[PDB]
Design a binder for this molecule. Structure first.
Ligand SMILES: *[C@@H]1O[C@H](CO)[C@@H](O)[C@H](O)[C@H]1NC(C)=O
Ligand SMILES: *[C@@H]1O[C@H](CO)[C@@H](O)[C@H](O)[C@H]1NC(C)=O
Lengths: 196, 109, 124, 109, 124, 168
């Protein structure tokens, strides 16, 4: 690869995956710049842990991982190392040790259909907490009482996935914020993704 | 699967008549159900959404809920505007389509 | 809202017919349009939906090689074609505006229709 | 060099309305801004501190944030508790003292 | 934690105001006590804090030499006075405890008034 | 020595006192008394600058000739050649209190590493992007100073250790 890494494909994609099935895209064997990502909208939260967002170009890595999903305004701060929340515990567990960046910005112009955009969901109820950097898809009912409900939408037994549409009449707290997570790791292999 | 429901409703006018809409576990019990009525030579119109709510405009005299695999609709009184067929619809993942009921023709006595 | 679709003409089997749905009074690029037919001796039958912002559509497991569904932006009308029609396709055709916006097969559980339209007779 | 904000913003119950607060170079965007909710005839308490935390006991529906030289707090649902005064408090470096907003009243529509 | 202010009392123009508030239930020496006033119907205004382990009473520019501020740690209360009160100073006065403790000028960005005592209004 | 060791007020990290110039063991036991060049035992048988500040207990080991870290490469960098002593002792019943101590700040972000024996009392907002942040410390633009409050609940590696570097 002699041209730039396809961060335009992961940032300017026409659709984003939902929270409960967040994408895991791998960038490898590509010369990276990290110089074109400020051309987008002013970010709501552009925060990096471990590596400061100034020495990205001259620091050399071996693999880049990109996570991509869309979350409400009230839960942007939940995506953080050592945080407790509805997405922080049940949908996306960021580990306490985290070397990378989290980028959350506003997309209330093409990612919110008037009257409801039910295309995005999250998982409300789970049997336990979630291991860090893990995802799962559930299509069966979750029970909470002392009876196995086993597939009837009744009492004390509920569907796990809950949708949340984005009408434009909503305020800042319930707009769809697109958030990506750029993750790096230690040098255990010869470096290939590196600055020019 | 395919939704099933009785084609005829028996009851004298002036009191409550109950009708049921039966399905399966992959059809009902995971996804919600909705109710429609078809006027003579006209499009269907909404009755119940989210299994227990009523839209703005419809009469508030219609009550329906699901108790399991089947869902029951309770109507109060039979007028001429209530004599149209009532339809039952839901969504099932196993066929990736909107399954609909066969119909219930109600006649006054 | 206003939702009126054009009429249809009785056709002979082994031909293609066009049924057009017209939408007005709302933003055409922020809702879904569903095709549902009424034939005698049976209830409503469901075919598929079109998202009027891209090409991503879905079909039914029964209507696969007989229906093709396309969209338009400048007229804001949805065009649906019936191919290789038989005697079992004698039905009136409803185009229904569905509230909300879904494009996946795990999304339709909240997809309840909002406004329907007057049917157009199609006969073998 | 004092904070300014609209005296009143009206919102219908059931969804969210926003309270805006704009400051200068040395008031907002260099120092943290805090939000105080004042019950009528009582001492005001903490509502929003450091722009993304909340104190314990506050329900998770009060979202305030700042981007440039202005800050905005969004309150969702106005039933019987948000018909109070909201103050925009931040530290002023030039005058070497805390300065406060004019006082915003929120009423239902 | 509780802070109890003094009672309401009317003072004539040209006299002093003796308003005090008592701290109880927490460590007195480890928390700054600010002072916040409120005219009836207007917004809030600031007075200045006390560092209750030394004598450092910073004031605002509008009340640089018009106030007298005193700590009485023997009876765990904090006093303040007003010199030549006018009709513009007819207001209510709160004393508030900010979390943490710093007495420098450039440290108040991490200072918010957590708990507030009851009001005591003074008039002309 | 009585003026700089028992002083009631110790300056913060980025703006440290430089006091020009008894016995030193009459204080609390020392966390680290490691003189370089001169030895502590032969010191009493043997221009003196006395720079004093406060350090979090984790970062006391960063005060050494010729090693990087956090505050070392931004706030107080010792030169490569050093002839002085470093004296770090416990201070937990003086400079730590419940709710935190928001006085003893430290400078966290800087443009580059600083020259040895230099201080810079500035607050102008660091620019961490490409947009020129003249006075707005919003997103991708952060304030330099940061304060670590001291609590008795905190462990041994976070107490405020008053330190003095008696550079001969
Ligand atoms: C995203 O794609 C749109 C449409 O092609 C284009 O107009 C825009 O410049 C792209 N933006 C970025 C950040 O690549
Ligand atoms: C420090 O100063 C205080 C007050 O003057 C005094 O009581 C104390 O003995 C002094 N301690 C030392 C060891 O300097």
């Amino acid at each position: 690869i002699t041209n730039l890494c396809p961060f335009d494909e992961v940032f300017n994609a026409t659709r984003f995956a939902s929270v409960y099935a967040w994408n895991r895209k791998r960038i490898s064997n590509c010369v990276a710049d990290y110089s074109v990502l400020y051309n987008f909208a002013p970010f709501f939260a552009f925060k990096c842990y471990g590596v400061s967002p100034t020495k990205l170009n001259d620091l050399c890595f071996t693999n880049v991982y990109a996570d991509s999903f869309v979350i409400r305004g009230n839960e942007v701060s939940q995506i953080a190392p050592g945080q407790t929340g509805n997405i922080a515990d049940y949908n996306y567990k960021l580990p306490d040790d985290f070397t990378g960046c989290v980028i959350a910005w506003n997309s209330n112009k093409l990612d919110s259909k008037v009257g409801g955009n039910y295309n995005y969901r999250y998982r409300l109820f789970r049997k336990s907490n979630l291991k860090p950097f893990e995802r799962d898809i559930s299509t069966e009912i979750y029970q909470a009482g002392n009876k196995p409900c086993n597939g009837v939408a009744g009492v004390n037994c509920y569907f796990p996935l809950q949708s949340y549409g984005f009408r434009p009449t909503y305020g800042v707290g319930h707009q769809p914020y697109r958030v990506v997570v750029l993750s790096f790791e230690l040098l255990h292999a010869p470096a290939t993704v590196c600055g020019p | 699967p395919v939704l099933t429901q009785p084609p005829s409703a028996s009851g004298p006018p002036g009191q409550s008549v109950s009708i049921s809409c039966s399905g399966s576990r992959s059809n009902i019990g995971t996804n919600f159900v909705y109710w429609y009525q078809q006027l003579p030579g006209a499009a269907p119109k909404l009755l119940i959404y989210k299994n227990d709510q009523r839209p703005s405009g419809v009469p508030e005299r219609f009550f329906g809920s699901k108790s399991g695999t089947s869902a029951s609709l309770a109507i109060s009184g039979l007028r001429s505007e209530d004599e149209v067929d009532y339809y039952c619809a839901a969504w099932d993942d196993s066929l990736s389509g909107h399954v609909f009921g066969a119909g219930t023709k109600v006649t006054v006595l | 809202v206003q939702l009126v679709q054009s009429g249809a003409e009785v056709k002979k089997p082994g031909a293609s017919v066009k049924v057009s749905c017209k939408a007005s009074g709302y933003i055409f690029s922020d809702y879904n349009i569903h095709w549902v037919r009424q034939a005698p001796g049976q209830g409503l039958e469901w075919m598929g939906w079109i998202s009027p912002d891209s090409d991503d559509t879905n079909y039914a497991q029964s209507f696969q090689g007989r229906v093709t569904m396309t969209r338009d932006t400048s007229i804001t009308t949805v065009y649906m074609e019936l191919s290789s029609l038989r005697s079992d396709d004698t039905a009136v055709y409803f185009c229904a505006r569905s509230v909300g916006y879904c494009s996946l097969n795990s999304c339709q559980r909240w997809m309840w229709f909002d406004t329907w339209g007057q049917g157009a007779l199609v006969t073998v």
